[PDB]
Design a protein around this nucleic acid. Structure first.
Lengths: 247, 716, 717
RNA sequence: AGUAGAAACAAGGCC
RNA sequence: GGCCUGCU
């Protein structure tokens, strides 16, 4: 209802009507990357250079009615000048910090579920036990090891199929979950995601983070367990080995 | 041909057929029977669905035509001929809603009331064979398959015909008419045979026209066409062609190995010419500090008030006068600029509130010294063609300069300790692991040995100056700003102290490219007379500004006080890299810790404590007139820190080129020192590659001299 | 004492203190003005290493071209570009013989990729030469412009959505008598019409520029960027070349750094130790001189034709078009030249297009000679560059040729006591030669060099040296009985990246962690790097601890936030909070590390999806600090000012499409249906199934269907 | 002048 | 003379 009237509104104007009529779905991606903005070759130089300007960041126009134009001391927090090729306005970093001290507040109960792998790492490090460090020549041999702790033993596309099935049931396409392991993963992750109001895209990236396994070729010495490769920086060195038992 | 399929079939049907064919890449030009078959299939499906609207509850009205009604219901949803994505989306949605079994292959329609999919096919052969073909193709089959024929006959599963008799008879008659009419021209002959060939698609990437001709001009010289070259390659057989032309090739094409012995290497030739002069952005070993003993942290303060306080602690100012003129600019402008800075400082002091950033009046003196209106006017080439002096920008080799002794003494001074600590690093999480405690102890040793070092003071000066210059350039692209050069140190007793080295007057800084130059005027206090090493002060105008009475046993010396005034320029890239000079600490102490850990592997215990306290081991870190002198680990740390700091201060393309081309030679020499029988193919080329980078950079020339000394002492 | 750090090498071996020889703490050299002089130098030089070839006049572009293939064999040790077709084909044959079925399997994989690739893949690239504007534009923008021009001219096979159909359109455009593009003036539009020859030259041209931030060289170099017509063919050829390389143990190009080190260690172990007592072993640390200038695309076509033997003709054609286009490639000279007049005190800019007619009175002797020598090859403001590759673009295939040369020394093909092996990545190699005597060692080295000269590959004798096996160098990896850490190469990556506050923090800690894992960064060095990174982070984003009294533009808000919070240990460093990072926390994001210490008010305000700010793998938790920095905003003064409105409208349409298709952002949409058609069909079916069993009921369902019907009526109209 | 080093900056353009 | 722009 709300979508179709907006579609009619966009189709009313000649330019947007032509864009919709001539642009095919396949090219939808291309036009989404169509931009005059060139990727920066020296981001550090610009960030050090841009941070000395007034209004060096950009924000949605909503900020104009959610944050005051000036704080108590009279410093500008945002400007009404739009970005180059966007409806977003240019705002200063004081708008961020202000939002962090006087902006709207919400319940962050979902975030521990959103980035649950990172919280799992936090809690495993918190409950870990250290031991004596042994100084000795480390024979570090370079091997391909899996870095993701919560790997479900699914490939990128094999996992993405489950992601689409659980998050976007009607956009799956022709693919049917052939393996019963994928099927039971779908059952369980749909059972626990019956009513979770967070937008589907963060759910998809949740489940990519949790399910997809990743490999990397690194110099390892001992360990080789997925939870021990997590703290390889902390447990191995050129001349020392730190005994550590992740929680 | 296509005139037929367009004239008989509805433009809607043919348009959908074109969409369907071009979806997979087929062409109606080459596969016409496929186009006609797709049109027939689409029309049969639509007329199967059309004019038959399901009423309120399960049963359907066979309406006379599409009627305007509140009953927008249809007995079938048409999945055929939408798109792969859209057809599968509809299939998935309706399957999820009604729970019907998902069809492994795209069906044609979906009947709602009976809640099942239906597949419709038109067959040139007899219906039964095609029916059983799609039955074996469609297993897990709960869908209702209905099959028609161009001749007309029908079949379906369970002998079940979902559509009523009259509508099916209409479809039969339409197919019948199509067939006899198409035969009336006789294409039915081709349609009888094309069925089995249509289903599979052959890809047809072909080279023709222009791109074909180009293909005939991209081959070896003795080939006339791409067909001939491809045939030759296909029939190619290895018959010892490499060996034959190796025999034919001249023996002068060789890689003869020249042995590399002790007497082989030659001392690098350094350029000859006038001695090189100082190019750094500030005085390093000649700087003087005015102190106030301010208990305020690295940024807790207003730079202008700090500068005023530091200048009010010193008494003995004199009417400034020129001592060492610039010799190529206007010295009166420099003197007047210094007096203008003094006047502006007094003006700032008298006012109520100290401004955080002060703008300097754009007088003639600062206008000349900061290079305003110096760039030539940009003109179109059509307006300036006959001007005699018009020519390309001067692009020649930099002027040659001989090495001078001052740079080596400056590097000596940069490695000595001082009575002040120049580094207070940020905090880090409390150490919980034993390795974290070891790292903290090693880091404390490093900072204890490095903090009191002139290289670290140079790091602080460069970071502060470049940060201030970049921030001022971005904030005020038009105003001449006064920036006091401020540092802050910890005396050995623990008290805090603020130090003023001088002032920078920054001009207009409309910096577009990373190489765009912002000019500034640097004014620095000093006690070193410019008449002792004038060649080092080529671009400086040195004035005499005061007198100092420093504590000495011979009464009190009452030395003079000069002010080195010069014009310099910097860039956004140069300023950005000078704002990150603290990576020199990382480089030096990473090398030191790498050495410590290499020695800690052989001896099964950490050796940082022994290395730093016991002062046991020593390394060659310089040469004295008697010979090579070795120093403890702390001197090595300071020397590497100074080397990195001077690499950052004296960066240049010459330095990079020399570093690479001399690393090659140093590794060759090291291989010689290990009895690895090293060899070379062209050593003169390597030497000329090393020597082309030594032009005028004092740092690069000093590095080349160091390499010559290393070659002299090595290889013995 | 006269301090001399170089003397430190009198006790510490060079490889164990090599980081001292890398001046990577100062600014790298940058190019300031034009890059046209370098381009003319490159064209003249690559035409000088092949001057003994055959001169031809291309019948399509009318341009002069030089063919050194099967030319006279070199009689000197200077760079040569006279590769022998027989030698290259025989090297390929022996490479296949030593690895049976490699070419067939690689061809199968490339065929599957070719048949399953889509046009959208061409959007994953950096600056590409948009010929419609004669300018470097992002990959997506150039692709969109090319698609629009083709659709306007009538080449719509790309609507199929397959990359190969786009290549079919590219080829079909070559046979059009005259195409039409659009030009903007200083605003409206103007239709310009290009002949067949003009379009050919614009499609065969590569845009040149100068390479900045190059470490280790005194002189600046010129690099090139291709157009959009040749990038799909290049993509397919690169797919085949990488498939071949993955199956070769002597190639290290497609793998990472640690994999390169593992390959080098394995080859050294297999060569030196297994050699018997009498056998001598040597290692050559070789660099190739003028690698690209002597790589002729015709030899690449020969290699492609050999590899694709006994394959479908369409596959051979589609994989052969790329070398065909690089053999006829043109180079755009560049920006031009800036002239100065001292007496009248003015400056002037001349484009490179005028170099073919400019009077040579304004140039130096060097530039005058360059222009005089290159003028014969100038065709419509571009220079013919047939003889050899400009820069890379076939690094995989060049590595394949190098690995073939390496494999020609298995002792099955040398038939002599000497033999060789090693590793080779484009323009760099390590060669281990084993032979019973120094005579045999030198004979093997000479034969390897001479065989390289027979394939157009030249050994740099000034940058190459041979020593005994056990010590060598390869791509700045210094092996001394085991690879040694080189922290200097990684030093430039220890500052704030410049993405945003959260991204910069995560990237810095992740870089420190990774260099601790791979590059042997010490614990104390890691702690100091963390401290320095946090200092630079606070000073760059004006986010100081808040307890400090450093006055900045952002300091008032930070102090008030500091005073407001009760538990100040939960504040992010960007909010003026303390640093809790250490060696044990480098793998944990800051938001999660400080999660249980945040105040509920601060935690909710920071991690709020409603914030108007949010729009080398590093983990990052989305917060208000994930903002996006402003844009260049220099568009407003140029003729190309209408791109901003087009971008905004495209974003509106794509956002609405996502509103219709939720998964449009997760996985890219596929389908030939126009956007409006797909949205309307989805709306119809969704309203259908919602009315039947869902939120919708009959009246509003009918209203939605009426709106859809009028939308389609407007579409057709 | 100064930065810089094989070509540039020392502001650009529109009224 | 004011305004516009600093990777387009």
């Amino acid at each position: 209802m709300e979508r179709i009237k907006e579609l009619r509104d966009l189709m009313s104007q000649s330019r947007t009507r032509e864009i919709l009529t001539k642009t095919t779905v396949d090219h939808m991606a291309i036009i989404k990357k169509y931009t005059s903005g060139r990727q920066e070759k020296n981001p550090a130089l610009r960030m050090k250079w841009m941070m000395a300007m007034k209004y060096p960041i950009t924000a949605d126009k909503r900020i104009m009615e959610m944050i005051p134009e000036r704080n108590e001391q009279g410093q500008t927090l945002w400007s009404k000048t739009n970005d180059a090729g966007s409806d977003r306005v240019m705002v200063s970093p004081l708008a961020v910090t202000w939002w962090n001290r006087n902006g709207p507040t919400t319940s962050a109960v979902h975030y521990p579920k959103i980035y649950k792998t990172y919280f799992e790492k936090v809690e495993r490090l918190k409950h870990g036990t250290f031991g004596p460090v042994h100084f000795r020549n480390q024979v570090k041999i370079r091997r391909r090891v899996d870095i993701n702790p919560g790997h479900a033993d699914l490939s990128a596309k094999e996992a993405q199929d489950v992601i689409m099935e659980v998050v976007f049931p009607n956009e799956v396409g022709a693919r049917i979950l052939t393996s019963e392991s994928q099927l039971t993963i779908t059952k369980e992750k749909k059972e626990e995601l019956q009513d979770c109001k967070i937008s589907p895209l963060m759910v998809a990236y949740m489940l990519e983070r949790e399910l997809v396994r990743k490999t990397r070729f690194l110099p390892v010495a001992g360990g080789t367990s997925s939870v021990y490769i997590e703290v390889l920086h902390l447990t191995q060195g050129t001349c020392w080995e730190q005994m550590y038992t992740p929680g | 041909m296509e005139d037929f399929v367009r004239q008989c079939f509805n433009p809607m049907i043919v348009e959908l057929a074109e969409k369907a064919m071009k979806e997979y890449g087929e062409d109606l030009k080459i596969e016409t029977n496929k186009f006609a078959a797709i049109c027939t299939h689409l029309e049969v499906c639509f007329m199967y669905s059309d004019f038959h609207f399901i009423n309120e509850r399960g049963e359907s009205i066979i309406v006379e035509s599409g009627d305007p009604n509140a009953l927008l219901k249809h007995r079938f949803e048409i999945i055929e001929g939408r798109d792969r994505t859209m057809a599968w989306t509809v299939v998935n949605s309706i399957c999820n809603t009604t729970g019907a079994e998902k069809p492994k292959f795209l069906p044609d329609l979906y009947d709602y009331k009976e809640n099942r999919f239906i597949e419709i096919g038109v067959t040139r052969r007899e219906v039964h064979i095609y029916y059983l073909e799609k039955a074996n193709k469609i297993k897990s089959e709960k869908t209702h398959i209905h099959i028609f024929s161009f001749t007309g006959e029908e079949m379906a599963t369970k002998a079940d015909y979902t559509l009523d008799e009259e509508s099916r008879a209409r479809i039969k008659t339409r197919l019948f008419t199509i067939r006899q009419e198409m035969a009336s021209r006789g294409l039915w002959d081709s349609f009888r045979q094309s069925e089995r060939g249509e289903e599979t698609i052959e890809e047809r990437f072909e080279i023709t026209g222009t791109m074909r001709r180009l293909a005939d001009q991209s081959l070896p010289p003795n080939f006339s066409s791409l067909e001939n070259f491809r045939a030759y390659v296909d029939g190619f057989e290895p018959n010892g062609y490499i060996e034959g032309k190796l025999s034919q090739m001249s023996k002068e094409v060789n890689a003869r190995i020249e042995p590399f012995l002790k007497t082989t290497p030659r001392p690098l030739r350094l350029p000859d010419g006038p001695p090189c002069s100082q190019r750094s952005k500030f005085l390093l070993m000649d700087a003087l500090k005015l102190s106030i003993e301010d208990p305020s942290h690295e940024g807790e303060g207003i730079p202008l008030y700090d500068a005023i306080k530091c200048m009010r602690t010193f008494f003995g100012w004199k009417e400034p006068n020129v001592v060492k003129p610039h010799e190529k600019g206007i010295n009166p402008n420099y003197l007047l600029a210094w007096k203008q800075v003094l006047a502006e400082l007094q003006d700032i002091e008298n006012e109520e509130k100290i401004p955080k950033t002060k703008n300097m009046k754009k007088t003639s003196q600062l206008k000349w010294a900061l290079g305003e209106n110096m760039a030539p006017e940009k003109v179109d080439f059509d307006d300036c063609k006959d001007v005699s002096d018009l020519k390309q920008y001067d692009s020649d080799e930099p002027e040659l300069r001989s090495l001078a002794s001052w740079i080596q003494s400056e590097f000596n001074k940069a490695c000595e300790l001082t009575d002040s600590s120049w580094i207070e690093l940020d905090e880090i999480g409390e150490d919980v692991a034993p390795i974290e405690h070891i790292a903290s102890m090693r880091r404390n040793y490093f900072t204890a040995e490095v903090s009191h070092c002139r290289a670290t003071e140079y790091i602080m000066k460069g970071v502060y100056i470049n940060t201030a210059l970049l921030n001022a350039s971005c904030a005020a692209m038009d105003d001449f700003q006064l920036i006091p050069m401020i540092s802050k140190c910890r005396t050995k007793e623990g008290r805090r102290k603020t130090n003023l080295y001088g002032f920078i007057i920054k001009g207009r800084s409309h910096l577009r490219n990373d190489t765009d130059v912002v000019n500034f005027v640097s004014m620095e206090f000093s006690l070193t007379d410019p008449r002792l090493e004038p060649h080092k002060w080529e671009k400086y105008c040195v004035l005499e500004i005061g007198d100092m009475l420093l504590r000495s046993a011979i009464g009190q010396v009452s030395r003079p006080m000069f002010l080195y005034v010069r014009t310099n320029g910097t860039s956004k890239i140069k300023m950005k890299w000078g704002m990150e000079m603290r990576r020199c600490l990382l480089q030096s102490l990473q090398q030191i810790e790498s050495m410590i850990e290499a020695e800690s592997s052989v001896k099964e215990k950490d050796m940082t404590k022994e290395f730093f306290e016991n002062k046991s081991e020593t390394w060659p870190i310089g040469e004295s007139p008697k010979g090579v002198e070795e120093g403890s680990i702390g001197k090595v740390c300071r020397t590497l820190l100074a080397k990195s700091v001077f690499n950052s201060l004296y960066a240049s393309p010459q330095l990079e080129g020399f570093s690479a081309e001399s690393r090659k030679l140093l590794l060759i020499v090291q291989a010689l020192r290990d009895n690895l029988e090293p060899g070379t193919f062209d050593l003169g080329g390597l030497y000329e590659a090393i020597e082309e980078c030594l032009i005028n950079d004092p740092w690069v020339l000093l590095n080349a001299s160091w390499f010559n000394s290393f070659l002299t002492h090595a290889l013995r | 004492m006269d301090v001399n750090p170089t003397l430190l090498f009198l006790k510490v071996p060079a490889q164990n203190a090599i980081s001292t020889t890398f001046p990577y703490t100062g600014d790298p050299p940058y190019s300031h003005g034009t890059g046209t002089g370098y381009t003319m130098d490159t064209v003249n030089r690559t035409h000088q290493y092949s001057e003994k070839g055959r001169w031809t006049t291309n019948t399509e572009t009318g341009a002069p071209q030089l063919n050194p293939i099967d030319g006279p064999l070199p009689e000197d040790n200077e760079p040569s570009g006279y590769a022998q077709t027989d030698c290259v084909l025989e090297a390929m044959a022996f490479l296949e013989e030593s690895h049976p079925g490699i070419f067939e399997n690689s061809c199968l994989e490339t065929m599957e990729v070719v048949q399953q690739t889509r046009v959208d893949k061409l959007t994953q690239g950096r600056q590409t030469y948009d010929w419609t504007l004669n300018r470097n534009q992002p990959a997506a923008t150039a692709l969109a412009n090319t698609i629009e021009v083709f659709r306007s001219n009538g080449l719509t096979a790309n609507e199929s959505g397959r990359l190969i159909d786009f290549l079919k359109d590219v080829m079909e455009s070559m046979d059009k008598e005259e195409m039409e593009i659009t030009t903007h003036f200083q605003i409206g539009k103007k239709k310009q019409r290009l002949n067949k020859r003009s379009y050919l030259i614009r499609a065969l041209t590569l845009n040149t520029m100068t390479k900045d931030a190059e470490r280790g060289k005194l002189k600046r170099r010129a690099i090139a960027t291709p157009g959009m017509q040749i990038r799909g063919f290049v993509y397919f050829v690169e797919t085949l070349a990488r498939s071949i390389c993955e199956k070769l143990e002597q190639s290290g190009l497609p793998v990472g750094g640690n994999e390169k080190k593992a390959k080098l260690a394995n080859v050294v172990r297999k060569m030196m130790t297994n050699s018997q007592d009498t056998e001598l072993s040597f290692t050559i640390t070789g660099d190739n001189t003028k690698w690209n200038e002597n790589q002729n695309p015709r030899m690449f076509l020969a290699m492609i034709t050999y590899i694709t033997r006994n394959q479908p003709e369409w596959f051979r054609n589609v994989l052969s078009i790329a070398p065909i286009m690089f053999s006829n490639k043109m180079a755009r000279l560049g920006k031009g030249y800036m002239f100065e007049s001292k007496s009248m005190k003015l400056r002037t800019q001349i484009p490179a297009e005028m170099l073919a007619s400019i009077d040579l009175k304004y140039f130096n002797d060097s530039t005058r000679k360059k222009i005089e020598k290159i003028r014969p090859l100038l065709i419509d403001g571009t220079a013919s560059l047939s003889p050899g590759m400009m820069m890379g673009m076939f690094n995989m295939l060049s590595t394949v040729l190098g690995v073939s040369i390496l494999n020609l020394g298995q002792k099955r093909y040398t038939k002599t006591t000497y033999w060789w092996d090693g590793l080779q990545s484009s323009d760099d190699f390590a060669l281990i030669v084993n032979a019973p005597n120094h005579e045999g060692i030198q004979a093997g080295v000479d034969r390897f060099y001479r065989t390289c000269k027979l394939l157009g590959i030249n050994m740099s004798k000034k940058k190459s040296y041979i020593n005994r096996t056990g010590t060598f160098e390869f791509t700045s990896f210094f092996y001394r009985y085991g690879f040694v850490a080189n922290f200097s190469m990684e030093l430039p990556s220890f500052g704030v990246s410049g993405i945003n506050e959260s991204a910069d923090m995560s990237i810095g800690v992740t870089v420190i962690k990774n260099n601790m894992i791979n590059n042997d960064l010490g614990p104390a060095t890691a702690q100091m790097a963390l401290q320095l990174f946090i200092k630079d982070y606070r000073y760059t984003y004006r986010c100081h601890r808040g307890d400090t009294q450093i006055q900045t533009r952002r300091s008032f808000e930070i102090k008030k936030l500091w005073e407001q919070t009760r538990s100040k240990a939960g504040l992010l460093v960007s909010d003026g909070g303390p640093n809790l990072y250490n060696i044990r926390n480098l793998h944990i994001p800051e938001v999660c590390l400080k999660w249980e210490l945040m105040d509920e008010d601060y935690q909710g305000r920071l991690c709020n999806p409603l914030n108007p700010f949010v729009s080398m793998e590093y983990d990052a938790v989305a917060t208000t600090h994930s903002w996006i920095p402003k844009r260049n905003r220099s568009i407003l003064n140029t003729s190309q000012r209408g791109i901003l409105e087009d971008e905004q409208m495209y974003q509106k349409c794509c956002n609405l499409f996502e509103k219709f298709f939720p998964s449009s952002s997760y996985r890219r949409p596929v389908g030939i249906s126009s956007m409006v058609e797909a949205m309307v069909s989805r709306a119809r079916i969704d309203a259908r199934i919602d009315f039947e069993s869902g939120r919708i009921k009959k009246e509003e369902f009918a209203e939605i269907m009426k709106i859809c019907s009028t939308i389609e009526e407007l579409r057709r109209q």
